[PDB]
Amino acid sequence: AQIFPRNANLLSRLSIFALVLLVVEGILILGVYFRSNYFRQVNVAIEQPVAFSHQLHVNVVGIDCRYCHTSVDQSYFANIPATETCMTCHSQIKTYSPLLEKVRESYATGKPIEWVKVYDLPNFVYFNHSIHVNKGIGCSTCHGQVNNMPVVWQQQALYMGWCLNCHRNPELYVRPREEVYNMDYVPPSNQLEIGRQLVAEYGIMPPDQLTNCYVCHR
Amino acid sequence: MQPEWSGDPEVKPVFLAVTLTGMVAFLLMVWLFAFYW
Amino acid sequence: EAYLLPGETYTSISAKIGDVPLTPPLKTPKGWLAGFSVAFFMLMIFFVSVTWLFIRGVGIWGINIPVGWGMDIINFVWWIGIGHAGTLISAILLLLNQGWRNSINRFAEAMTLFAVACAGLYPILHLGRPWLFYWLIPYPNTHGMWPQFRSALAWDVFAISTYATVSLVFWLVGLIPDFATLRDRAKNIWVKRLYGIAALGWRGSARHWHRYEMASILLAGLSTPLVVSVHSIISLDFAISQVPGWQVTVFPPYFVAGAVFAGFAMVLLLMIPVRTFYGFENYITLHHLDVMAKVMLTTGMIVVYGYFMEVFASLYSGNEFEEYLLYNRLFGPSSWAYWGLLFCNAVAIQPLWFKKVRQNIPALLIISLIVSVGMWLERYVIIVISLERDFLPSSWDIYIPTIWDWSLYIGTFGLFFTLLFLFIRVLPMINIFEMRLFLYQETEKAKQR
Amino acid sequence: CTYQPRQYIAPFDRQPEGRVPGIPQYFASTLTLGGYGTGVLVRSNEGRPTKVEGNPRHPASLGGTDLFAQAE
Ligand SMILES: CCCCCCCCCCCCCCC(=O)OC(COC(=O)CCCCCCCCCCCC(C)C)COC(=O)CCCCCCCCCCCC(C)C
Ligand SMILES: CCCCCCCCCCCCCCC(=O)OC[C@H](COP(=O)(O)OCCN)OC(=O)CCCCCCCCCCCCCC
Numbered sequence: 050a051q052i053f054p055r056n057a058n059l060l061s062r063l064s065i066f067a068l069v070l071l072v073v074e075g076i077l078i079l080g081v082y083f084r085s086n087y088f089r090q091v092n093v094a095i096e097q098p099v100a101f102s103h104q105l106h107v108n109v110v111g112i113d114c115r116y117c118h119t120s121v122d123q124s125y126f127a128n129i130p131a132t133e134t135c136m137t138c139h140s141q142i143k144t145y146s147p148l149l150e151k152v153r154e155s156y157a158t159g160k161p162i163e164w165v166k167v168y169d170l171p172n173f174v175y176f177n178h179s180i181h182v183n184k185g186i187g188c189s190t191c192h193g194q195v196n197n198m199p200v201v202w203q204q205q206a207l208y209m210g211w212c213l214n215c216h217r218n219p220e221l222y223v224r225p226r227e228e229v230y231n232m233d234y235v236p237p238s239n240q241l242e243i244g245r246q247l248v249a250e251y252g253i254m255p256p257d258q259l260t261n262c263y264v265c266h267r
Numbered sequence: 268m269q270p271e272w273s274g275d276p277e278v279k280p281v282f283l284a285v286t287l288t289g290m291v292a293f294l295l296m297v298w299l300f301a302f303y304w
Numbered sequence: 305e306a307y308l309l310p311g312e313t314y315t316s317i318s319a320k321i322g323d324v325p326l327t328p329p330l331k332t333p334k335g336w337l338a339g340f341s342v343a344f345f346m347l348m349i350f351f352v353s354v355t356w357l358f359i360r361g362v363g364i365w366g367i368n369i370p371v372g373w374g375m376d377i378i379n380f381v382w383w384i385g386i387g388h389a390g391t392l393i394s395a396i397l398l399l400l401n402q403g404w405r406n407s408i409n410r411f412a413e414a415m416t417l418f419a420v421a422c423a424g425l426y427p428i429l430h431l432g433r434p435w436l437f438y439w440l441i442p443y444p445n446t447h448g449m450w451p452q453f454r455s456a457l458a459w460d461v462f463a464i465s466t467y468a469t470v471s472l473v474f475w476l477v478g479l480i481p482d483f484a485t486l487r488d489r490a491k492n493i494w495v496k497r498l499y500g501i502a503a504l505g506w507r508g509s510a511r512h513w514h515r516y517e518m519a520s521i522l523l524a525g526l527s528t529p530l531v532v533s534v535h536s537i538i539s540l541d542f543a544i545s546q547v548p549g550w551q552v553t554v555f556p557p558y559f560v561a562g563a564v565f566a567g568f569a570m571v572l573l574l575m576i577p578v579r580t581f582y583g584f585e586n587y588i589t590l591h592h593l594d595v596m597a598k599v600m601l602t603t604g605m606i607v608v609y610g611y612f613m614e615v616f617a618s619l620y621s622g623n624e625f626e627e628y629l630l631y632n633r634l635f636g637p638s639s640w641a642y643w644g645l646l647f648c649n650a651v652a653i654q655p656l657w658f659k660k661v662r663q664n665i666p667a668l669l670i671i672s673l674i675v676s677v678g679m680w681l682e683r684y685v686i687i688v689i690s691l692e693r694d695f696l697p698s699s700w701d702i703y704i705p706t707i708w709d710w711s712l713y714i715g716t717f718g719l720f721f722t723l724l725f726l727f728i729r730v731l732p733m734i735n736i737f738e739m740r741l742f743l744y745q746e747t748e749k750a751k752q753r
Numbered sequence: 754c755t756y757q758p759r760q761y762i763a764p765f766d767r768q769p770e771g772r773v774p775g776i777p778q779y780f781a782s783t784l785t786l787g788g789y790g791t792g793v794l795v796r797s798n799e800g801r802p803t804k805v806e807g808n809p810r811h812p813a814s815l816g817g818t819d820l821f822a823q824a825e
């Protein structure tokens with residue numbers, strides 16, 4: 050009463066409340082920014098120098114995924130296709146076109162097509178495509194419906210926890226090993242009984258083995 | 268002995284406000300750190 | 305003697321303590337200005353050393369493959385052990401009902417807070433990837449990773465965070481009616497609100513004093529096992545290891561005793577200039593210096609007992625690694641640290657038994673400086689010499705510190721003194737209340753005869 | 754700011770015939786110290802030598818090499 054006015058008590062209590070809320074909001078803003086789709090480049094159509102259309106080339110043309118990603122069932126690296134593979138068909142279809150001008154500019158010189166890596170793992174991670182494909186994990190469960198993508202986006206961020214989710218509960222995501230390249234496959238109504246059956250059939254290791262550090266990191 | 272604010276009609280409204288703020292902040296932190304991905 | 309000289313009133317105590325703050329900045333003493341200039345120059349040295357460390361790496365120091373912990377960890381344990389005596393005066397002396405805490409606890413707890421502030425950067429500074437100190441904290445991440453919590457460094461995270469937080473909380477609680485006194489004693493209307501919002505309208509109410517005394521008692525009875533657990537955990541970040549100099553089980557009370565020893569050395573070394581430069585001879589007395597040196601002598605005797613325990617373990621064991629640990633300390637390439645440690649922690653404490661030496665001020669200053677040097681040598685002997693020579697003799701090397709960890713040490717000294725000079729500028733060095741309450745208690749004792 | 758930079762990728766213009774992308778490939782070569790060659794199995798990761806191993810079919814190799822052939 051000598052110094053501070055009448056509303057100083059309410060002002061001090063509201064200041065303590067607003068400081069606690071501001072700390073919580075700052076922690077929340079930092080967490081949302083580090084989990085956001087902009088930061089993790091998720092659900093954004095990453096632009097390519099040619100703007101290759103997976104939707105056309107799979108849902109319309111009908112090219113199998115192993116025609117272009119030839120090394121996906123044999124090595125860790127799914128094959129980014131060659132200009133030879135593109136010009137195998139594009140020596141006749143839609144020639145003298147400005148959107149295939151970059152592909153025609155390649156294969157005459159040794160200069161490749163500098164595609165942008167949509168799914169970029171940070172080089173200590175060591176994903177293996179061959180064991181994941183051969184152990185009954187389809188492309189749609191981990192890359193999305195790329196057969197309908199005009200421009201390829203990241204369906205999810207490649208979090209360590211998201212990887213360990215399927216390494217600890219694979220029965221929610223395993224599929225007959227013959228439905229891996231099928232983009233029309235959907236999991237059934239129950240899926241848990243057949244997931245446990247397929248884990249036992251393919252000998253999928255327990256979550257301790259699959260959650261070992263040197264499975265992925267190196 | 269009794270507390271300082273004993274007998275004040277604003278005590279249970281401000282306790283419900285503090286507990287509501289705590290449970291909203293807790294549920295929001297749980298959503299961001301567990302069910303956001 | 306007495307812990308309060310006669311001739312003091314409550315208004316005289318309030319004026320004589322609160323008039324060293326609340327002075328205009330044009331009336332700031334030249335001694336404070338010179339000390340703050342030296343402290344700010346060494347803080348610039350701190351900034352230069354930290355910047356070059358962050359630019360280049362932790363390889364600017366002398367640490368190598370066998371000695372991965374060096375002067376960074378020595379200065380960490382040194383600076384975190386400075387704060388134990390201030391926590392003791394703030395908490396254990398309140399628990400024990402000792403009347404000499406009333407004139408040293410504010411400055412000693414401020415020294416504790418600034419020493420913990422200097423020693424909390426040292427994990428982040430030595431970390432090697434300094435920006436990932438939060439991975440040691442249990443925090444929610446997208447990886448699903450956790451800290452191990454079986455290591456002692458996770459316990460160090462929890463202990464250092466709890467020690468800093470509860471020490472700051474107890475210091476602010478002990479400052480709130482001093483904030484009320486400064487808010488009452490201020491002259492300018494805009495510096496009233498500086499201490500008014502920190503006093504929160506204290507009013508000195510007897511209903512508020514009951515809850516205040518209960519909270520201070522419970523904070524003391526929580527901060528005594530807090531500080532013992534913090535220095536036990538800082539002992540444990542060597543004692544949980546299999547290193548022959550570090551797998552020693554008397555380390556938690558030994559580190560408690562060494563921290564209280566070095567803390568009261570620094571406390572005496574900073575009371576004595578404060579006592580002789582401010583008018584605090586009536587408050588900080590020769591009895592205060594005598595009992596602080598008595599606690600120094602007791603805790604230094606416990607550390608000497610810990611040295612005897614380590615020497616007994618080495619001689620009593622048939623273990624070749626314990627025998628070579630004793631041999632390496634006695635006659636190794638780093639035996640200077642052990643011999644100077646024995647001189648500075650065993651020879652220099654036998655004068656402290658004597659009453660005239662205990663009452664003497666320059667002897668106390670020399671003894672406190674020698675004890676601080678010898679405690680740095682103790683932490684050198686514990687860490688560096690044990691890490692230098694290990695189980696495999698092929699993995700033996702010498703730890704030679706560079707100029708950069710010495711520059712960081714001088715810089716953290718400057719940060720500590722900068723924070724201390726800011727504290728003695730804007731805040732009272734000693735508690736305005738609980739010393740007028742001490743005067744009332746001594747008046748009641750004189751009335752009771 | 755994002756989590757990572759753009760990270761461009763660079764495929765071939767013509768795929769190699771006997772190469773699967775991502776599978777390291779072993780070639781039997783010969784490394785000489787003082788003119789006396791020893792058989793080495795040098796690993797080509799993507800068309801480039803990265804690790805020298807020993808050639809078990811070779812007399813002075815037997816799967817093991819020396820430090821000079823390893824540091825070639
Ligand atoms: C290996 C692990 C060992 C576990 C150690 C546990 C010790 C913790 C004790 C905390 C001090 C509280 C005393 C309050 C008080 O001042 O008591 C007053 C009486 O007033 C009261 O009515 C009590 C006030 C509230 C008390 C509630 C305490 C909350 C529970 C603590 C949370 C800890 C967790 C683990 C549950 C008078 O009594 C005293 O003043 C006596 C104080 C005795 C100090 C003990 C000093 C021992 C130092 C050794 C420390 C050991 C290391 C391992 C920590
Ligand atoms: C330092 C790390 C360990 C701290 C543990 C210390 C114990 C703190 C809590 C115990 C409280 C004891 C009850 C209070 C009390 O009686 O002490 C105050 C007492 C009496 O003071 P008056 O009220 O009568 O007035 C006097 C001044 N006006 O004062 C004392 O005499 C102090 C008691 C000494 C305590 C002894 C503890 C020693 C710890 C030894 C640990 C073992 C080490 C083994 C290596």
Ligand code: HEC
Binds near residue numbers: 125168182186187230
């Ligand atoms: C989930 C477990 C996946 C499945 C099933 C398939 N892929 Fe994959 N793909 C996945 C990750 C985590 C990554 C990043 C790897 C890296 O090091 O960045 C990829 C990457 C690709 C790529 C880019 C080239 C490469 O890194 O190999 C392509 C062309 C690709 N994936 C295609 C692809 C196809 C067609 C798949 C089904 C047969 C397939 N991947 C399986 C995750 C997963």
Ligand code: HEC
Binds near residue numbers: 099137
């Ligand atoms: C043969 C099976 C093909 C391969 C291999 C690739 N493409 Fe193709 N492409 C093919 C067809 C039949 C069509 C559609 C023609 C039509 O009339 O609709 C396309 C389309 C494209 C386009 C669009 C051209 C346009 O619409 O004018 C582009 C830019 C394109 N394809 C690029 C492309 C690249 C870079 C390829 C190698 C990865 C590639 N295609 C493969 C036939 C075939």
Ligand code: HEC
Binds near residue numbers: 168201
């Ligand atoms: C050749 C005509 C292809 C076929 C058939 C499929 N993909 Fe492809 N894929 C192709 C190219 C030229 C590229 C790089 C350019 C781009 O748009 O990304 C890719 C890349 C992918 C990716 C992105 C991987 C990355 O760069 O991070 C994915 C996820 C991918 N391909 C998956 C995929 C699947 C599941 C397919 C079968 C339905 C498929 N691709 C067909 C070329 C061709």
Ligand code: HEC
Binds near residue numbers: 175208216
């Ligand atoms: C579910 C859709 C998965 C996700 C997401 C990831 N992985 Fe996986 N991984 C999965 C299966 C079914 C298996 C089979 C292993 C078995 O014994 O059944 C694996 C295995 C791997 C391996 C092989 C290592 C080994 O088996 O010893 C690697 C190197 C691997 N996974 C890497 C990896 C990474 C880096 C991931 C995050 C991008 C990841 N996997 C996700 C299923 C799934």
Ligand code: HEC
Binds near residue numbers: 208261264265266
């Ligand atoms: C494959 C299934 C993995 C296993 C097993 C482990 N980690 Fe992982 N790690 C994996 C991925 C896909 C990522 C990238 C996460 C992202 O958000 O992009 C990581 C990353 C990490 C990190 C973060 C690295 C950084 O931000 O600089 C850490 C700290 C990490 N991984 C640690 C870690 C440890 C210690 C593991 C064993 C217990 C571990 N990961 C398992 C994939 C996988």
Ligand SMILES: CCCCCCCc1cc(O)c2ccccc2[n+]1[O-]
Binds near residue numbers: 380424440460
């Ligand atoms: C947010 C508080 C975290 C600060 C303390 C970090 C704990 C910590 C971390 C370390 O790497 C250490 C290495 C050697 C010695 C002590 C250490 N401490 O205490």
